[PDB]
Amino acid sequence: MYTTAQLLAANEQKFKFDPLFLRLFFRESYPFTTEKVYLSQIPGLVN
Amino acid sequence: MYTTAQLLAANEQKFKFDPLFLRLFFRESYPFTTEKVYLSQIPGLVN
16 A cells, blocks of 8 residues: 555566477478368389 | 369479580580491501
8 A cells, every 4th residue: 555666677587489490491381272282292213 | 162272383393404524525416317327446566
């Protein structure tokens, strides 16, 4: 009621988080205008 | 049915090969005009 507290700076408590993956390997990115996607992997073995 | 399914990748992962012998030892080419091919040598040995 008459304490008259004084506030100092409070902490922030950050989170240790660095992707390395959404910045290293996944450089490419695309949208989907369709319901699904297709992936092609054609092996080449000539005789 | 309703399978629009846009594709985005066509990875091959086909083969791993490089001669390097074509440049290592046989730099010079000599296509034939005739059919018979003659090559010889000279041995060096003396008492």
